[PDB]
Structures are given as C-alpha cells and as structure tokens.
Amino acid sequence: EPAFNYAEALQKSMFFYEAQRSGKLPENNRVSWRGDSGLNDGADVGLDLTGGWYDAGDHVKFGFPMAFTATMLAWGAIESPEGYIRSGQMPYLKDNLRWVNDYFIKAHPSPNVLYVQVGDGDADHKWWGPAEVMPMERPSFKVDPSCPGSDVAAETAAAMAASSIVFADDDPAYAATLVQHAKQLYTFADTYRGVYSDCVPAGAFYNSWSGYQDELVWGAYWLYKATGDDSYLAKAEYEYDFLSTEQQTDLRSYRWTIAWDDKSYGTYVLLAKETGKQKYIDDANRWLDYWTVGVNGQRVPYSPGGMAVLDTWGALRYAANTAFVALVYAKVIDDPVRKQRYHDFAVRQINYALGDNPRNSSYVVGFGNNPPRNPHHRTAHGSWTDSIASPAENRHVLYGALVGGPGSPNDAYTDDRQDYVANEVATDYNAGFSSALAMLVEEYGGTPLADFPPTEEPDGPEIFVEAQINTPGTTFTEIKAMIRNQSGWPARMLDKGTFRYWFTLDEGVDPADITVSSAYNQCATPEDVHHVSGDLYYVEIDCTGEKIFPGGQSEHRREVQFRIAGGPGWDPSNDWSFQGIGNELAPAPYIVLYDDGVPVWGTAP
Ligand SMILES: OC[C@H]1O[C@@H](O[C@H]2[C@H](O)[C@@H](O)[C@H](O[C@H]3[C@H](O)[C@@H](O)[C@H](O)O[C@@H]3CO)O[C@@H]2CO)[C@H](O)[C@@H](O)[C@@H]1O
Ligand SMILES: [Ca+2]
Ligand SMILES: [Ca+2]
C-alpha cells in the first residue's frame, strides 16, 4: 500500500492555503483561528485590494510568488485531476484557486495596470503578531507602462490562463473572465518590457534574478493551452531560443530548478510534451539527469539520507518542485531507463519529506511522525507580546505546511521557530509539493481523514481581567486590575471595553460619601457609583477608545488601579466582585468585562 498517506498530506496542504488567506473570510471558513484581516488593503489608492494570500510567515502580499503558486497548483490539477478527485480535495483546490484569482482580478483594474504588492516588507517584518490585529500601514504598489514588470505580469497571465482550464467545465463564465484578463496581462508584459523589481520595493525579498525571458515563454504556453490559439504556441517556441545558456557553453541552463523566479525548466518539459521536438527533450533530459545521475561528472548535492539539496533556502521546496516536474516528464518520455530514473527520483524526494529520512520524521506540519511544531509563522504562533520567543510553542497547528528542512546535505534539522532557514513556510513551498502529491495519490492512492480539520480550543481565557488587593484597608478597598487581551481563536481587537465591580452597601455607609480614586489608571476614573437595586451598587471603569489587542507588551493590557473609599462601616466581605481577590494578581471571575456592552468575561450578580 502507499508508504505514506499521500491523500491525507494533500488534504492538509489544501488547509494550509486556506490558513494563508487575507481579507474578509467566508462563513464556511474551516480555520477557526483565522479571522478577517487586511480589510483596508488598497484604500491608499482608492481600490479594493482585499483578498489573496499572505506570502509566508509574514503578512505581505507578494504578487510574483503568489501568481507562480497559483500556476503550479493549477498545473497539478490539470495533470492529475484524478488525484484530487480521489483524495476528495478537488473542491478545496478549486476554492483555493478561485480565492487567489478573485484577487488577481481586483488587482487588474485596467488592461495595463497590475497591483503587485500590498504591504511593506520592512514595516511588516518588524512586528511579530497575528494578522487580524496588524497595527501598521500597508502601502499598495503596482506596475504599468510608466514602470513595467513583464515577469510578474506574464506570471499572473499564466496563473489566470492555467486556472481557466480548471474551471472551464465548472464555471465557463468565470473561466472566460480569467482568459480575457490573461490575454491583456500578457500583451502588457510583451509590449512594455521590464523587470518588476526595478519598480516595486520587492528586491530584498523576491528579486527578479532570472529576468523576464522565461516568463514570456511560460506565459505564452499557458495562454496557448487556455485559448487553443496557435499563435501563442508559436510565440512560446520563438522566445524559447532566448533562454539563458550556462556559463561558457551554448547549453541552456540545467543546474537549478523551477521555482517562483525561473520557469525555464518547466518550459523544457512542457514544450517537449506538446511538440515532441528533440530540442526540448535534450534540454529537459540534461536538467533531470543533473538532478539524478549527473552530467559531465557534475550532480546536485545529495545528503547521505538521500535528499537532493540544491541550496540553503527552502531546500525541500526545490526538491519537491523538481519531483513534480520529473513525474510529469516521466509520463511523456519513452525511454524505459529514463522513465524509471525520473519517476523513482520523484517518489524518493517526496517520501523523504513525508518521513522516509534518517530522522524518521515528517517535514509537513501536523502530518506523520514527529512533525515540526514551531514553524516560523506569526499567526500560527499567536504571540501577544510582539515576541517570536513567547509563548514557547506555537498556539495553533498549521496543518499541511512544508518547512524549509535541512539546508545542507547532512540531513540535520532542528524544529526551532527562530530558524528561518529550517522552519520557514511559504505559499510557493507547497506549490510543487501539492502537485506532486496529486500525481502520487492517483498512482498509489490513500484515504483522506473523515473528520478534518480538528476544532482547536483556546489555551485559556482569551480576554479577561486579573486583580489583586493593591493596598490593604478597612475604610476602603484598593484594587489593582489588569485587563488582558491574549486572544488567538481568532486574535481580535478590544477597543470598547468597560468593566463593573459590584459591591454591597454596608450599614452606616452613605452612598453619597463613597469616592472612587486612583494614582494610576490607563482608563477613565469615575466620579460616582451606580445603584442597581436594594443594597447592590457597582463601580464602572470605562476603557472605550483604548485599543487593547494581542500585539505587544503594552498593547495587550491596560492597568487600572482604583480605590473605593466608603469610610468607617465599609465591609468588603459581602461584596460580590471581591470574592476570590487576593494579594497575587490572578483572574477575577466576579469582575465582568464588556465589549461594547456585551459580556465577555466574568459572572454578574
Ligand atoms: O543564480 C542561480 C539561480 O538563481 C535563481 O534565483 C534564486 C536566487 O539565486 C536565490 O538567492 C533565491 O533565494 C531565495 C528563495 O528563492 C526564497 O524562497 C527564500 O525565501 O529567500 C531566498 C533569498 O533569501 O531564490 C531564487 C530562486 O530560486 C535563478 O532563478 C536561476 O535562474 C539561477 O540560475
Ligand atoms: Ca524569471
Ligand atoms: Ca459591603
């Protein structure tokens, strides 16, 4: 039977993409720890740019990798719709693709204008906290004729074109809209030549290293498949001759692999598959050979454990990308030896990621044996103090996310959230990986979990009030209260909070003589007390206007010290809210906290 349950892995991979969503989430949201976020995206330019996916463990919406991810996901669904159908994940794949494509449509207000980034890398990365309460400004960036971006425009064209093929039978109207958009974007990319990173501040994160030549071939091919227009195939084959050669020879690049930046490698296989020309077969063969048996004595580094390690960053992402394409190629090539070689290589690399390695551990969060528990992800972590170090363990399980893994050919790895090398996660990391999984499900099978996702429960009160006796007294009660917002299911703002402290009027105490004072109060200090009925009264502290959210030391809490002086006769032992308050700060269950008038914590009399 399947060495690993590929269907379950795919099922969880689809969940990962759902957890990366930005904007107003649907009613059917499966990720209980995710809520609405980035609701003001595009506002700075008068556009609705909400939606799309957060790139990695951060909250920037990087259009280049986002588009590539979409193209790769669509490609896998086209190659193996059966894998998706059998794992019962086809509806989730479509849902995910529709989500990102709806964003691309919004980001393309007119034929030659494409918004390629929402958020600033540096501003975004300086803060460590949940997406729902991001406190910083998020700038929108775009490319147009004045400052083009052929690479990102052609990639978005390819994503929309590829995706249209997936919706073709389901929603032909939607598929038509995507094709129309892809045509415009490609014309823009072809007419106004230029590297997008020269126009938008993405160079430090997703710089266009390879340039746009590869995207022109890639985009042309996909539009050909989506339209059936021969001119596109012609365009692709023409542009193919301008692809990068290697070092000193006239041999096209074969030492890297396909990823968010370089699509050359994908076109080798795609064109070979389409035309059957020896030209493409030679290129594709050379590349895949380098990753397996080597060419001219040179071969991609391999660990003793059997992992192909291309580079330090997202090592497993590269191996998985190659594995998917090797699986596709293995089907078109006739050579029995090459077919076996490429196919077996792909299965071995994916199996390594699922647990077949020297550590005997899965590299997919929430899957298999001894998986990573602390991926470098802000929202999954759920910090409320703007610290990557607290709490020790991530508060949520980011099911399905493939981590960077071993960055050196020695199979070494440490599950450490602070290691952005080994524990980084990203939308592009799961792209080739998912497509590979779909191919494997079709071949080896597997069964998805009937009840997934699990419903997580909070690790304690999320929004509450702690209290302690600040100064002991007989004619007064001085409390030191602390409002806390450590929410994570999902993280949410508390900007309209107030709390009540009930007390019973005592014999010999005139309510008119009761005073409430403070020497330190981050909220308002009331002048009077409120009579409920009989001898029941309450003091109300008003914190409306204070933004209490899980995003920093001072941000997540509000300190309130208040003294209720009643004079001789004052007796707190018959006071409702006094029950259980001691000398140590601890949750006060009898002090009720309200959010815009609605009880959120504590029990009233
Ligand atoms: O020159 C070698 C090949 O480079 C490819 O571009 C890669 C860059 O060289 C590499 O530094 C960059 O690393 C990224 C990584 O992709 C990203 O996922 C991670 O989060 O951050 C890294 C930087 O810190 O990756 C790109 C893409 O592989 C060219 O695409 C290729 O043509 C060229 O031969
Ligand atoms: Ca490129
Ligand atoms: Ca009393």
PDB file of N, CA, C and O in Angstrom, residues 571-599:
ATOM      1  N   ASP A 571     -17.386  47.410  54.432  1.00  0.00           N
ATOM      2  CA  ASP A 571     -17.154  45.988  54.650  1.00  0.00           C
ATOM      3  C   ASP A 571     -17.150  45.258  53.313  1.00  0.00           C
ATOM      4  O   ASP A 571     -18.199  45.061  52.704  1.00  0.00           O
ATOM      5  N   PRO A 572     -15.959  44.852  52.838  1.00  0.00           N
ATOM      6  CA  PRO A 572     -15.848  44.178  51.539  1.00  0.00           C
ATOM      7  C   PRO A 572     -16.200  42.697  51.540  1.00  0.00           C
ATOM      8  O   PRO A 572     -16.346  42.102  50.475  1.00  0.00           O
ATOM      9  N   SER A 573     -16.347  42.098  52.716  1.00  0.00           N
ATOM     10  CA  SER A 573     -16.654  40.671  52.780  1.00  0.00           C
ATOM     11  C   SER A 573     -18.012  40.269  52.225  1.00  0.00           C
ATOM     12  O   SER A 573     -18.254  39.092  51.987  1.00  0.00           O
ATOM     13  N   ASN A 574     -18.897  41.231  52.010  1.00  0.00           N
ATOM     14  CA  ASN A 574     -20.193  40.903  51.437  1.00  0.00           C
ATOM     15  C   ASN A 574     -20.293  41.493  50.033  1.00  0.00           C
ATOM     16  O   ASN A 574     -21.396  41.660  49.497  1.00  0.00           O
ATOM     17  N   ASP A 575     -19.136  41.799  49.444  1.00  0.00           N
ATOM     18  CA  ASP A 575     -19.071  42.371  48.100  1.00  0.00           C
ATOM     19  C   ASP A 575     -18.881  41.286  47.056  1.00  0.00           C
ATOM     20  O   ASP A 575     -17.902  40.538  47.089  1.00  0.00           O
ATOM     21  N   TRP A 576     -19.781  41.263  46.086  1.00  0.00           N
ATOM     22  CA  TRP A 576     -19.743  40.279  45.012  1.00  0.00           C
ATOM     23  C   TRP A 576     -18.402  40.194  44.289  1.00  0.00           C
ATOM     24  O   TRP A 576     -17.791  39.125  44.228  1.00  0.00           O
ATOM     25  N   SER A 577     -17.942  41.313  43.736  1.00  0.00           N
ATOM     26  CA  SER A 577     -16.688  41.305  42.985  1.00  0.00           C
ATOM     27  C   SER A 577     -15.418  41.093  43.804  1.00  0.00           C
ATOM     28  O   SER A 577     -14.364  40.813  43.246  1.00  0.00           O
ATOM     29  N   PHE A 578     -15.536  41.140  45.126  1.00  0.00           N
ATOM     30  CA  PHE A 578     -14.381  40.959  45.998  1.00  0.00           C
ATOM     31  C   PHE A 578     -14.020  39.478  46.181  1.00  0.00           C
ATOM     32  O   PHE A 578     -12.874  39.139  46.494  1.00  0.00           O
ATOM     33  N   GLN A 579     -14.995  38.601  45.954  1.00  0.00           N
ATOM     34  CA  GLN A 579     -14.809  37.156  46.110  1.00  0.00           C
ATOM     35  C   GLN A 579     -13.606  36.598  45.368  1.00  0.00           C
ATOM     36  O   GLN A 579     -13.547  36.652  44.145  1.00  0.00           O
ATOM     37  N   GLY A 580     -12.670  36.019  46.110  1.00  0.00           N
ATOM     38  CA  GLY A 580     -11.511  35.413  45.490  1.00  0.00           C
ATOM     39  C   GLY A 580     -10.320  36.295  45.204  1.00  0.00           C
ATOM     40  O   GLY A 580      -9.287  35.783  44.762  1.00  0.00           O
ATOM     41  N   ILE A 581     -10.444  37.604  45.420  1.00  0.00           N
ATOM     42  CA  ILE A 581      -9.331  38.510  45.160  1.00  0.00           C
ATOM     43  C   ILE A 581      -8.339  38.401  46.306  1.00  0.00           C
ATOM     44  O   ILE A 581      -8.730  38.447  47.471  1.00  0.00           O
ATOM     45  N   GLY A 582      -7.067  38.221  45.975  1.00  0.00           N
ATOM     46  CA  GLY A 582      -6.051  38.086  46.999  1.00  0.00           C
ATOM     47  C   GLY A 582      -4.895  39.039  46.803  1.00  0.00           C
ATOM     48  O   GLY A 582      -5.044  40.079  46.167  1.00  0.00           O
ATOM     49  N   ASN A 583      -3.733  38.675  47.328  1.00  0.00           N
ATOM     50  CA  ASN A 583      -2.556  39.523  47.221  1.00  0.00           C
ATOM     51  C   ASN A 583      -1.725  39.273  45.966  1.00  0.00           C
ATOM     52  O   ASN A 583      -0.784  40.012  45.676  1.00  0.00           O
ATOM     53  N   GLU A 584      -2.072  38.234  45.217  1.00  0.00           N
ATOM     54  CA  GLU A 584      -1.360  37.926  43.982  1.00  0.00           C
ATOM     55  C   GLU A 584      -2.300  38.211  42.815  1.00  0.00           C
ATOM     56  O   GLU A 584      -3.507  37.973  42.907  1.00  0.00           O
ATOM     57  N   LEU A 585      -1.754  38.754  41.735  1.00  0.00           N
ATOM     58  CA  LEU A 585      -2.545  39.064  40.556  1.00  0.00           C
ATOM     59  C   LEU A 585      -2.997  37.731  39.950  1.00  0.00           C
ATOM     60  O   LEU A 585      -2.174  36.857  39.677  1.00  0.00           O
ATOM     61  N   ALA A 586      -4.308  37.570  39.791  1.00  0.00           N
ATOM     62  CA  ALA A 586      -4.895  36.353  39.237  1.00  0.00           C
ATOM     63  C   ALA A 586      -6.234  36.720  38.625  1.00  0.00           C
ATOM     64  O   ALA A 586      -6.796  37.764  38.955  1.00  0.00           O
ATOM     65  N   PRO A 587      -6.769  35.880  37.715  1.00  0.00           N
ATOM     66  CA  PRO A 587      -8.051  36.187  37.068  1.00  0.00           C
ATOM     67  C   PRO A 587      -9.154  36.411  38.088  1.00  0.00           C
ATOM     68  O   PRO A 587      -9.297  35.626  39.034  1.00  0.00           O
ATOM     69  N   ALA A 588      -9.934  37.472  37.887  1.00  0.00           N
ATOM     70  CA  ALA A 588     -11.033  37.813  38.784  1.00  0.00           C
ATOM     71  C   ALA A 588     -12.356  37.467  38.111  1.00  0.00           C
ATOM     72  O   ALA A 588     -12.865  38.230  37.299  1.00  0.00           O
ATOM     73  N   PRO A 589     -12.930  36.306  38.433  1.00  0.00           N
ATOM     74  CA  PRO A 589     -14.155  35.834  37.783  1.00  0.00           C
ATOM     75  C   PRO A 589     -15.420  36.631  38.108  1.00  0.00           C
ATOM     76  O   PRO A 589     -16.438  36.478  37.424  1.00  0.00           O
ATOM     77  N   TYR A 590     -15.364  37.469  39.142  1.00  0.00           N
ATOM     78  CA  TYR A 590     -16.531  38.244  39.544  1.00  0.00           C
ATOM     79  C   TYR A 590     -16.534  39.702  39.105  1.00  0.00           C
ATOM     80  O   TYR A 590     -17.395  40.488  39.505  1.00  0.00           O
ATOM     81  N   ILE A 591     -15.535  40.060  38.310  1.00  0.00           N
ATOM     82  CA  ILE A 591     -15.448  41.389  37.728  1.00  0.00           C
ATOM     83  C   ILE A 591     -15.840  41.079  36.294  1.00  0.00           C
ATOM     84  O   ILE A 591     -15.267  40.188  35.669  1.00  0.00           O
ATOM     85  N   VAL A 592     -16.880  41.732  35.808  1.00  0.00           N
ATOM     86  CA  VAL A 592     -17.345  41.472  34.459  1.00  0.00           C
ATOM     87  C   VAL A 592     -16.797  42.485  33.479  1.00  0.00           C
ATOM     88  O   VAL A 592     -16.825  43.692  33.740  1.00  0.00           O
ATOM     89  N   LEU A 593     -16.291  41.975  32.360  1.00  0.00           N
ATOM     90  CA  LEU A 593     -15.742  42.793  31.286  1.00  0.00           C
ATOM     91  C   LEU A 593     -16.740  42.777  30.122  1.00  0.00           C
ATOM     92  O   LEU A 593     -17.264  41.720  29.758  1.00  0.00           O
ATOM     93  N   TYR A 594     -17.030  43.952  29.575  1.00  0.00           N
ATOM     94  CA  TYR A 594     -17.968  44.082  28.475  1.00  0.00           C
ATOM     95  C   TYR A 594     -17.271  44.650  27.256  1.00  0.00           C
ATOM     96  O   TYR A 594     -16.415  45.534  27.368  1.00  0.00           O
ATOM     97  N   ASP A 595     -17.668  44.152  26.093  1.00  0.00           N
ATOM     98  CA  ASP A 595     -17.142  44.600  24.815  1.00  0.00           C
ATOM     99  C   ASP A 595     -18.340  45.251  24.134  1.00  0.00           C
ATOM    100  O   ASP A 595     -19.257  44.560  23.666  1.00  0.00           O
ATOM    101  N   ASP A 596     -18.367  46.580  24.160  1.00  0.00           N
ATOM    102  CA  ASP A 596     -19.452  47.336  23.558  1.00  0.00           C
ATOM    103  C   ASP A 596     -20.787  46.919  24.193  1.00  0.00           C
ATOM    104  O   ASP A 596     -21.788  46.742  23.508  1.00  0.00           O
ATOM    105  N   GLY A 597     -20.778  46.738  25.511  1.00  0.00           N
ATOM    106  CA  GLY A 597     -21.987  46.352  26.220  1.00  0.00           C
ATOM    107  C   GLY A 597     -22.246  44.858  26.357  1.00  0.00           C
ATOM    108  O   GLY A 597     -23.100  44.447  27.142  1.00  0.00           O
ATOM    109  N   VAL A 598     -21.512  44.044  25.611  1.00  0.00           N
ATOM    110  CA  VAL A 598     -21.687  42.596  25.656  1.00  0.00           C
ATOM    111  C   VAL A 598     -20.669  41.935  26.580  1.00  0.00           C
ATOM    112  O   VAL A 598     -19.463  42.120  26.417  1.00  0.00           O
ATOM    113  N   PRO A 599     -21.144  41.146  27.552  1.00  0.00           N
ATOM    114  CA  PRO A 599     -20.290  40.402  28.478  1.00  0.00           C
ATOM    115  C   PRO A 599     -19.332  39.478  27.739  1.00  0.00           C
ATOM    116  O   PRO A 599     -19.743  38.699  26.876  1.00  0.00           O
TER     117      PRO A 599
END
